[PDB]
Amino acid sequence: LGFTSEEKNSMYKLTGAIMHFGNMKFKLKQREEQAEPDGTEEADKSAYLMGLNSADLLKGLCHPRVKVGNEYVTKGQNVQQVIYATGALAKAVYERMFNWMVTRINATLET
Amino acid sequence: RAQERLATALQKLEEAEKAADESERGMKVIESRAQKDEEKMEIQEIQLKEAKHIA
Amino acid sequence: TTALVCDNGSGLVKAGFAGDDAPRAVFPSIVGRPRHQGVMVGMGQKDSYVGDEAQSKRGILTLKYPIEHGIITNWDDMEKIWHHTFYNELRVAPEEHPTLLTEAPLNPKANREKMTQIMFETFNVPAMYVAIQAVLSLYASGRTTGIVLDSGDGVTHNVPIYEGYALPHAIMRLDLAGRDLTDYLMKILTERGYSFVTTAEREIVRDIKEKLCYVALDFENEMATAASSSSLEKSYELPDGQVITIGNERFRCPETLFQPSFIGMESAGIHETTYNSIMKCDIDIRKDLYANNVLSGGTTMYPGIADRMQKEITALAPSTMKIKIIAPPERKYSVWIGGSILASLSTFQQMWISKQEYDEAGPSIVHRKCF
Ligand SMILES: Nc1ncnc2c1ncn2[C@@H]1O[C@H](COP(=O)(O)OP(=O)(O)O)[C@@H](O)[C@H]1O
């Protein structure tokens, strides 16, 4: 099909990253209701695959920032919330890659 | 006068980068101390729960 | 169709649409009017600025707040505030949107009645509803049980709730809040020679408070350390210069919440009214209430207030009980979050006050089962 070998390579690695999302581990904090990661190895490897920073992705999962008018304030998360977010992220990236693959297929077919 | 306040701006830049490197080194040592403190406080919170349970 | 969620409060209007994670329009609830002469012909200047526009022209206007302590005291100004919120910050036609409004517990009845009368006659909404702020804080907190302390800018209150049932006889309301903290900080800044008297300098003092003040864990030891060392001194740069140096009044200001005798009030601190609401509740729910003490509102945003309140409530309550204080980072907007959640609930769509109900029953329909 019309697409290169690097592109198949990226497809395979992206699917492997989706697979690496599942083993993440989060714990509640000391005397609070905030989620913090205890295991970091799968985080590091999933970031190295995805093309992001590991500390940065962990911070983006534990502490989302939302827009209130003209400012940004950090939102709090617990383990259930961060797990639901991880699952929704994986489902989203998979479905996105799928739709774009179909677009590539149609572009190859296009006359 | 331009070179005068220029030299003062440059010496301010020197001492300002001094203050900045002090800020960064201090925050490193203090985040290490912090993480140590939370390790200690969590282990002692669990030990407090153990103690009340034995009580 | 979508509902609007306008959380007025006393000093910060924040509005948006039901079903979002945050308000899209947050601005002060001030109405400024020019107080000087006006010389340039053809300048075509207006007569009253509202919202964030009035903050850029503080040096020319006299700033009014239309809401003193929860209560609305200037209905013309409030109508201007609402018009601005609907048409200039949000850009929506309020005749095609239900509107959810909030108010504090234990306010006058005419406040609420006149509010709905305005919203139906002037702005012509299809439906509307007024909600208690503490209940919405509890929605946004993800709980159904807990005692919520909602310190806004004009009013502080506790509202204990258990399994979704609110205990009205244990509701406490206190008229000490951020506005009184600002006035006290203006009064004690004069000990070092700074004087802020203008309504436009009140805003400078409010920004100082927000950026520099914090709650001390131990007030006497912090006073001693401020007297001895100089490691607490912090500087602030006014809109011009003459950087001001602030010492122990960094923490003497918000300590008024725990010692209301500082501003000559008779009542007790927020920790003690929280504990009193607890002991006012039943006995079978006090453990859950101790374990679900929820903070919200802007005046709960000082560094150290959660730890201080936990220390105090723990010293008050019995030793066998575990006290817990829930203080999310998005506390300032909790009432709005909860309002959005509630208005998006599909069960709620039968709770609106429709326009026909109002037309047939008068503004009295608001205290009725249509709450
Ligand atoms: N970071 C902060 N630290 C201390 N006080 C704050 C902070 N942010 C806001 N405030 C105070 O909170 C008040 C606004 O609270 P808000 O949630 O807007 O209540 P309302 O909406 O009822 O006016 C302001 O008077 C301000 O002084």
From Swiss-Prot, chain A:
Subcellular localization: Cytoplasm, Myofibril; Cytoplasm, Myofibril, Sarcomere
PTM sites of type Phosphothreonine: 40
Phenotype when changing residue 103 to M: In MPD1; uncertain significance
Effect seen on changing residue 11 to T: In CMH1; uncertain significance
Function: Myosins are actin-based motor molecules with ATPase activity essential for muscle contraction. Forms regular bipolar thick filaments that, together with actin thin filaments, constitute the fundamental contractile unit of skeletal and cardiac muscle.
Domain remark in the UniProt entry: The rodlike tail sequence is highly repetitive, showing cycles of a 28-residue repeat pattern composed of 4 heptapeptides, characteristic for alpha-helical coiled coils.
Disease: Cardiomyopathy, familial hypertrophic, 1: A hereditary heart disorder characterized by ventricular hypertrophy, which is usually asymmetric and often involves the interventricular septum. The symptoms include dyspnea, syncope, collapse, palpitations, and chest pain. They can be readily provoked by exercise. The disorder has inter- and intrafamilial variability ranging from benign to malignant forms with high risk of cardiac failure and sudden cardiac death.
Family under the similarity heading: Belongs to the TRAFAC class myosin-kinesin ATPase superfamily. Myosin family.
Subunit structure: Muscle myosin is a hexameric protein that consists of 2 heavy chain subunits (MHC), 2 alkali light chain subunits (MLC) and 2 regulatory light chain subunits (MLC-2). Interacts with ECPAS. Interacts (via C-terminus) with LRRC39.
Other observations noted: The cardiac alpha isoform is a 'fast' ATPase myosin, while the beta isoform is a 'slow' ATPase.
Name the record gives this protein: Myosin-7
Annotated organism of origin: Homo sapiens (Human)
Swiss-Prot record, chain B:
Residue span of region Disordered: 16-36
Expressing tissues: Detected in primary breast cancer tissues but undetectable in normal breast tissues in Sudanese patients. Isoform 1 is expressed in adult and fetal skeletal muscle and cardiac tissues, with higher expression levels in the cardiac tissues. Isoform 10 is expressed in adult and fetal cardiac tissues, but not in skeletal muscle.
Protein origin, superkingdom: Eukaryota
Compartmental location: Cytoplasm, Cytoskeleton
Related illness: Cardiomyopathy, familial hypertrophic, 3: A hereditary heart disorder characterized by ventricular hypertrophy, which is usually asymmetric and often involves the interventricular septum. The symptoms include dyspnea, syncope, collapse, palpitations, and chest pain. They can be readily provoked by exercise. The disorder has inter- and intrafamilial variability ranging from benign to malignant forms with high risk of cardiac failure and sudden cardiac death. Cardiomyopathy, dilated, 1Y: A disorder characterized by ventricular dilation and impaired systolic function, resulting in congestive heart failure and arrhythmia. Patients are at risk of premature death.
Function: Binds to actin filaments in muscle and non-muscle cells. Plays a central role, in association with the troponin complex, in the calcium dependent regulation of vertebrate striated muscle contraction. Smooth muscle contraction is regulated by interaction with caldesmon. In non-muscle cells is implicated in stabilizing cytoskeleton actin filaments.
Domain notes: The molecule is in a coiled coil structure that is formed by 2 polypeptide chains. The sequence exhibits a prominent seven-residues periodicity.
Record-stated family: Belongs to the tropomyosin family.
Protein name: Tropomyosin alpha-1 chain
Gene name linked to the record: TPM1
Part of the full-length chain shown: 101 to 155 of 284
From Swiss-Prot, chain C:
Chief location: cytoplasm
Enzyme Commission designation: 3.6.4.-
InterPro entries, sorted: Actin, Actin/actin-like_CS, Actin_CS, ATPase_NBD
Pfam families: Actin
The protein's enzyme class: hydrolase
Keywords carried by this UniProt record: Acetylation, ATP-binding, Atrial septal defect, Cardiomyopathy, Cytoplasm, Cytoskeleton, Disease variant, Hydrolase, Isopeptide bond, Methylation, Muscle protein, Nucleotide-binding, Oxidation
Gene Ontology cellular component terms for the protein in this record: actin cytoskeleton; actin filament; blood microparticle; cell body; cytoplasm; cytosol; extracellular exosome; extracellular space
Effect annotated for changing residue 119 to V: In ASD5; reduced affinity for myosin; normal actin filament polymerization ability; normal actomyosin motor function
Record's keyword annotation contains Disulfide bond: no
Methionine (R)-sulfoxide, modified sites: 40, 43
UniProt keyword ATP-binding present: yes
Linked residues for Isoglutamyl lysine isopeptide (Glu-Lys) (interchain with K-52): 266
Example GO biological process: cardiac myofibril assembly
Catalysis performed (reactions): ATP + H2O = ADP + phosphate + H(+)
Miscellaneous remark of the record: In vertebrates 3 main groups of actin isoforms, alpha, beta and gamma have been identified. The alpha actins are found in muscle tissues and are a major constituent of the contractile apparatus. The beta and gamma actins coexist in most cell types as components of the cytoskeleton and as mediators of internal cell motility.
Described purpose of this protein according to its UniProt entry: Actins are highly conserved proteins that are involved in various types of cell motility and are ubiquitously expressed in all eukaryotic cells.
Assembly with partners or alone: Polymerization of globular actin (G-actin) leads to a structural filament (F-actin) in the form of a two-stranded helix. Each actin can bind to 4 others.
Family: Belongs to the actin family.
Disease note: Cardiomyopathy, dilated, 1R: A disorder characterized by ventricular dilation and impaired systolic function, resulting in congestive heart failure and arrhythmia. Patients are at risk of premature death.
Entry protein name: Actin, alpha cardiac muscle 1
